[PDB]
Design an enzyme around this catalytic site. Structure first.
Site, short mmCIF file in Angstrom:
data_model
loop_
_atom_site.label_atom_id
_atom_site.label_comp_id
_atom_site.label_asym_id
_atom_site.label_seq_id
_atom_site.Cartn_x
_atom_site.Cartn_y
_atom_site.Cartn_z
N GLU A 1 0.53 -0.94 -0.37
CA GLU A 1 0.10 0.25 0.11
C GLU A 1 0.97 0.97 0.20
O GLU A 1 1.07 1.53 1.21
CB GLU A 1 -1.22 0.00 1.33
CG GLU A 1 -2.02 1.00 1.73
CD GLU A 1 -2.73 1.25 2.36
OE1 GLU A 1 -2.79 0.41 3.27
OE2 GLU A 1 -2.72 2.55 2.48
N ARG B 1 0.69 10.22 0.61
CA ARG B 1 0.74 11.47 0.97
C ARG B 1 2.11 11.64 0.66
O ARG B 1 2.24 12.82 1.75
CB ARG B 1 0.74 10.58 2.37
CG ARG B 1 -0.35 9.99 2.85
CD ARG B 1 -0.31 8.94 4.41
NE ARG B 1 -1.05 8.40 4.89
CZ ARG B 1 -1.20 7.86 6.34
NH1 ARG B 1 -0.10 7.66 6.97
NH2 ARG B 1 -1.53 6.34 6.15
N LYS C 1 -11.41 -1.48 6.59
CA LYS C 1 -10.63 -1.20 7.18
C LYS C 1 -10.29 -0.98 8.89
O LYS C 1 -11.26 0.39 8.88
CB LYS C 1 -9.23 -0.55 6.94
CG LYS C 1 -7.88 -0.22 7.39
CD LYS C 1 -6.84 0.71 6.77
CE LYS C 1 -7.59 2.17 6.60
NZ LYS C 1 -5.92 3.02 5.99
#
Lengths: 207, 207, 208
Positions: free
Chosen positions: A41, A45, A128
């Site tokens: 993943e 960001r 999640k």
């Protein structure tokens, strides 16, 4: 390609990668894949994140996805970079509707029952549990799993090598997200691979 | 003025509860004299709208309304001359109304779904509320690490000794606080002294 | 007939029932009514849950509702089964809109201010604080009740016989949800009636 349920079952731990330097991307993907953590993943960001996805996508064995997807546009940019799955900190109806319409493998974050109810209304049943240690941890997830018996989860947020096996003993959890496999300094591919192999060996009640 | 500029004006936004209408002018005068010119007046008290009109006439006061629950309360505060608006949480209805009305809204958030709803509406500045019941600084530090372009004002249980710790994080522009106006009859010299101390708080976000 | 406020005031504790065997539905409802806990929330967490609701509705004095209602269609299915009230773990706009349209006594879960504000926008002002012990407990409920002074609550999720009176001392709380009266396993009707009678005697600052 694979749906999000299939992605979650591939490995006990999904590393959560924050790539501050584009030159770190390939060594990190190679070392994680060398350790058996094939599911990567790459969080959206940092400015180089989408380029880091294009680099990791070419490492054999790597299953690259995008994290911190906040809207349908970012899901599109990540999919155009080759992401095979998408993770979001939380869920909106616009993001979830877009993923279902595009048949994108989305793993939306949830923190409370209303989040899960929005996901179930959209046809989703894989979430999640995030950020796990700020929202009551394993005992809170155990109760939420008791309410939503058809849902399965990937806790993420403050998970550790010590606590990951505890979460993974719950049948409703398929994997966990983790930040410890790649320390935030300059990558050390030997240390990264050894942490990945160690995490690869974690027992999973659900698999 | 937009909400980001409002948050950058002072390190602390006092959260005022005016029960005696006679207290409004001396309090706003003392807070302005101490360098805390951004004033949040909660709407819960019967005299709150009348207190906003008095404080608005104090030179240099930037008067806003707190505990805005819905579009009607926002309209009432905007009719009274409020330059900004604070809500405990965010709804799509209140957010779309604040955007259509060009109202500088600073909505509370507790989780990623709240933030993503605000981002979808065009908002990217939020009150992290109630801070000490949703995990405090450690939880806000993680949320800010995820939402890199979002900036926050924690409120709820902030104290003079904890406020500087929040303000070391550049994603935190200011804090909300109740201590600058002690309970009982106003002591203008004491309020101005507490205000000057808060105005001197250092913050990573604003030089 | 009854609105959700009136259901919450009926008894200090609303049992949260998980029926794993249809044969247990009637004895559990009879044991609870015999102990004075007439308000029965049957969670839609097992396939037989709707069947158990139809059985429990025939016990005299039973006020039967459905819990873990997840969407508008589920509320309709529970209504057709005879439910007089509905409980949901959280609140969606679609679920609350359908509940207010149908005049259904809905008690939706809330965990944060945005949940309550969505409910208030729909005209709802009665919520369960859920799951209470994973979202900050009584200290968090105290702060939320002081923000939303017109709202009244039913904390649920980890409530215990020891902690229920602590929650019930707060005038913003009308009742609590609890699992201890009918825990997992084969029913013990003597134990259930006895625990129901003890729960019926709990003091309430709000109801008396």
């Amino acid at each position: 390609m694979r749906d999000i349920d299939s992605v979650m079952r591939l490995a006990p731990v999904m590393p959560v990668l924050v790539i501050e330097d584009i030159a770190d991307a390939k060594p990190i993907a190679e070392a994680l894949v060398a350790g058996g953590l094939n599911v990567l993943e790459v969080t959206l960001r940092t400015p180089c994140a989408l380029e880091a996805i294009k680099i990791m996508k070419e490492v054999p064995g790597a299953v690259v996805g995008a994290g911190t997807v906040l809207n349908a546009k970012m899901l599109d940019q990540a999919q155009e970079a080759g992401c095979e799955f998408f993770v979001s900190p939380g869920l909106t109806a616009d993001l979830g509707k877009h993923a279902v319409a595009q048949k994108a493998a989305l793993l939306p974050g949830v923190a409370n029952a209303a989040d899960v109810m929005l996901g179930l209304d959209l046809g989703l049943d894989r979430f999640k549990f995030f950020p796990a240690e700020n929202i009551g941890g394993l005992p809170a997830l155990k109760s939420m799993a008791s309410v939503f018996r058809q849902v399965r989860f990937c806790p993420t947020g403050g998970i550790t090598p010590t606590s990951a096996p505890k979460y993974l003993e719950n049948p409703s959890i398929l994997c966990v997200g983790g930040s410890w496999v790649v320390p935030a300094g300059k990558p050390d591919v030997a240390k990264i691979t050894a942490l990945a192999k160690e995490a690869s060996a974690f027992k999973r009640a659900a698999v």
